[PDB]
Enzyme design. Structure first.
Site, short mmCIF file in Angstrom:
data_model
loop_
_atom_site.label_atom_id
_atom_site.label_comp_id
_atom_site.label_asym_id
_atom_site.label_seq_id
_atom_site.Cartn_x
_atom_site.Cartn_y
_atom_site.Cartn_z
N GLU A 23 112.87 95.19 -16.00
CA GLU A 23 112.39 95.16 -14.63
C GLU A 23 112.94 96.34 -13.84
OE1 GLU A 23 113.67 91.05 -13.31
OE2 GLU A 23 112.65 90.52 -15.18
N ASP A 43 108.47 89.56 -20.16
CA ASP A 43 108.54 88.12 -20.35
C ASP A 43 107.75 87.73 -21.59
OD1 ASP A 43 109.95 87.12 -18.00
OD2 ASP A 43 108.26 87.90 -16.86
N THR A 54 113.89 82.66 -12.26
CA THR A 54 114.81 82.84 -11.15
C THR A 54 114.60 81.84 -10.04
OG1 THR A 54 113.41 84.63 -10.28
CG2 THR A 54 115.36 85.24 -11.56
N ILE A 65 116.95 87.27 -16.58
CA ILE A 65 116.79 85.87 -16.29
C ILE A 65 115.33 85.58 -16.01
CG2 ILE A 65 117.52 83.93 -14.88
CD1 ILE A 65 119.84 85.57 -13.90
N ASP A 66 114.73 84.72 -16.83
CA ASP A 66 113.36 84.31 -16.59
C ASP A 66 113.50 82.94 -15.93
OD1 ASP A 66 110.63 82.90 -18.42
OD2 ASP A 66 110.57 84.13 -16.60
N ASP A 78 114.30 90.84 -20.31
CA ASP A 78 114.19 90.05 -19.09
C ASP A 78 115.48 89.25 -18.96
OD1 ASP A 78 113.77 88.22 -17.02
OD2 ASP A 78 111.63 88.16 -17.39
#
Lengths: 246, 254
Positions: free
Chosen positions: B58, B208, B83, B80-81, B78
């Site tokens: 990101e 993701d 959030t 933290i998927d 990714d």
């Protein structure tokens, strides 16, 4: 109206949980009868004067048991890790206590009139969110698939989604979704077409965790309306009911 | 392009998992900073062990250039998927680490932080969840399918209108149930194990998607573009299912 009943529900919910937990290592409606029978029998034998509501939703004034042998049936089939067993107990036409057990994650939610809510010994407390644009809202679809109920589902989804809800969740278990609310993991819940044996138990635990449960109209909860709007705060609840419709 | 990297990925996925697991046990953002910590943690080590590998995450690739995957060994990450779930302490958040080489998705690692489920996939070697060979349901009947989806991060009148439509479409298609859990990587991993039959989404970042794609593939499932076409890491959309028919029926569902 107390203790020995609660203790019985906790041990029944746990036993029921095990036969379910095992059934999940493969049209198996036989596990449904297996649980509801091991419960209604025990409960009946130990409390012969008590009534039973389980899968009409008419609540009388005598001690009665609202029971959902297996909530999350479609999840159960596809082995989606979200199925629960629910046991609620009422007396004098008011909810005394509720017990909901998350079979796979082994979590025992329990609430009791004026004694608070607890998930595996920890005290539950709702979020306190009041702002809707900062809310995580949960909702499900009844067992029905007619164009009408579907039309309502998408509309409420749309309306609610309009009001700037921060996010929506659909997990295939109204009783388990209600528990997330009780613990603060969610800010609100709403549904049309959910039987009373799914929200009975859950209501007691959400009330004891500091939240509120009312009818989709905004008025008080009506166990005969097959509907509900639970939230962290009244402001939250009323704002949801507002956005809803039909 | 192989082993020493997969091992590093697993290690990091687990380290990050711990950090976010410990974080979830506290609450008044805390999320924004943790996301930064975790990413710094994962990226800075990877850049240190393999200083010639490329990174698609990101923060990196914030240029507007979507998912420009060259043929070099690159990491699709990714931190933290989920959030939003993380903010509300909703127990469905993950860390996803993907690896591509020769412009092909090599291996993927997705970790369910709270449920401690470690999903992994390696091209031509199968998919696992905590040492357990994975396999898709092989359901072909959209009529009896559990379908998962998510709302993109966006909430503009456009993405929402599309969202209700697509949901309506799939519902008119007589699809059994629909689920929305706040995590595309985790939803996708469910499809990898058979707990679900299909997935679809518009407006989702490719990081993701990478690791989950390798995983669903080594599981017997199929990942394609919403338009029926072959997957396109730049079209920020996808359709995944247990069978080609299910997938066809899904995208067909316009």
């Amino acid at each position: 109206p107390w203790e020995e009943c609660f203790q019985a529900a906790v041990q029944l919910a746990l036993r029921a949980g095990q036969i379910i937990r095992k059934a999940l290592t493969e049209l198996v409606t036989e596990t449904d009868h297996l649980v509801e029978d091991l419960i209604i029998s025990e409960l009946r034998e130990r409390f012969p004067s008590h009534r039973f509501i389980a899968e009409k939703c008419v609540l009388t004034h005598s001690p009665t048991w609202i029971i959902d042998p297996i909530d999350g049936t479609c999840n159960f089939v596809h082995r989606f890790p979200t199925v629960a067993v629910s046991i609620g107990f009422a007396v004098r036409q008011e909810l005394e206590f509720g017990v909901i057990y998350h079979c796979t994650e082994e979590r025992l939610y329990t609430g009791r009139r004026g004694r608070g809510a607890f998930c595996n010994g920890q005290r539950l407390r709702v979020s306190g969110e009041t702002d809707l644009s900062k809310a995580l809202v949960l909702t499900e679809i009844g067992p029905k698939r007619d164009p009408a109920t579907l039309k309502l589902f998408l509309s409420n989804m749309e309306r609610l989604l309009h009001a700037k809800a921060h996010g929506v969740r659909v997990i295939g278990s109204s009783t388990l979704a209600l528990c997330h609310l009780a613990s603060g993991a969610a800010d609100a819940y709403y549904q049309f077409g959910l039987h009373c044996w799914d929200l009975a138990a859950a209501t007691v635990i959400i009330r004891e965790a500091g939240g509120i449960v009312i009818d989709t109209s905004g008025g008080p909860l009506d166990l005969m309306a097959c509907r509900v709007v639970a939230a962290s705060t009244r402001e939250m609840a009323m704002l949801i009911a507002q956005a809803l419709q039909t």
